């Protein structure tokens, strides 16, 4: 377990870095997840 690693791969910045990650966040926002990212 590592916080640096976790925030590097699944974090908000990494998600928004690409259109695929933006789509992940959009999917999770449509579903209503409390946690959209790490």
């Amino acid at each position: 377990p590592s916080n640096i690693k976790r925030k590097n791969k699944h974090g908000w910045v990494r998600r928004l870095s690409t259109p695929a990650g933006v789509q992940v966040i959009l999917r999770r926002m449509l579903k209503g997840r409390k946690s959209l990212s790490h």
Partner: protein, 176 residues
């Protein structure tokens, strides 16, 4: 000194301390900016005392002597803030015509939703601001499908709500 954090020693352990009405907004509108200033600090001291007492009562496992006056002080300070804020915005509307103190804009973030972006203070202008220019205030065409699906989700929630209201009205008319 530090005695102002506690009320008069004659009231310690009295279990009921008498207090008067809280300031209304209308009453505070007739006072000067300086009277509002000093009254603010008077209320600041009073609230600090009451918070100190509340915490100490929690610590001693005893009920607070009179918790209503804390609410009254809080309401008084909210009224004072409202009065001063009204004066500030009236003056701003007069001199500048602006309705809000903080500049902002209607922007459209990466997820395609309209937001009110509030501006920040910077030293360098925006075109050489490395961090600011990383933000995306536009949506690419892959968002519009998700925008449509969110719209449909909202529509579903509204339809359910309106239908449920109508069913409840039918039940009410049935009983009565």
């Amino acid at each position: 000194g530090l005695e102002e954090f506690f009320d008069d020693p004659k009231n310690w352990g009295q279990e009921k301390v008498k207090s008067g009405a809280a300031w209304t907004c209308q009453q505070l509108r007739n006072k000067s900016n300086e009277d509002l200033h000093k009254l603010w600090y008077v209320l600041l001291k009073e609230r600090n005392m009451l918070l100190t007492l509340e915490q100490e009562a929690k610590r001693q496992r005893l009920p607070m002597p009179s918790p209503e006056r804390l609410d009254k002080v809080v309401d008084s300070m909210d009224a004072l803030d409202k009065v001063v804020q009204e004066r500030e915005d009236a003056l701003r509307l007069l001199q500048t015509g602006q309705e809000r103190a903080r500049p902002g804009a209607w922007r459209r973030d990466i997820f395609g939703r309209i937001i009110w972006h509030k501006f920040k203070q910077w030293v360098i202008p925006w075109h050489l601001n490395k961090r600011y220019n990383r933000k995306r205030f536009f949506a690419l065409p892959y968002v519009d499908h998700f925008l449509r699906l969110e719209r449909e989700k909202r529509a579903r929630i509204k339809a359910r709500k309106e239908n449920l209201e109508r069913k409840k009205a039918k039940i009410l008319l049935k009983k009565f």
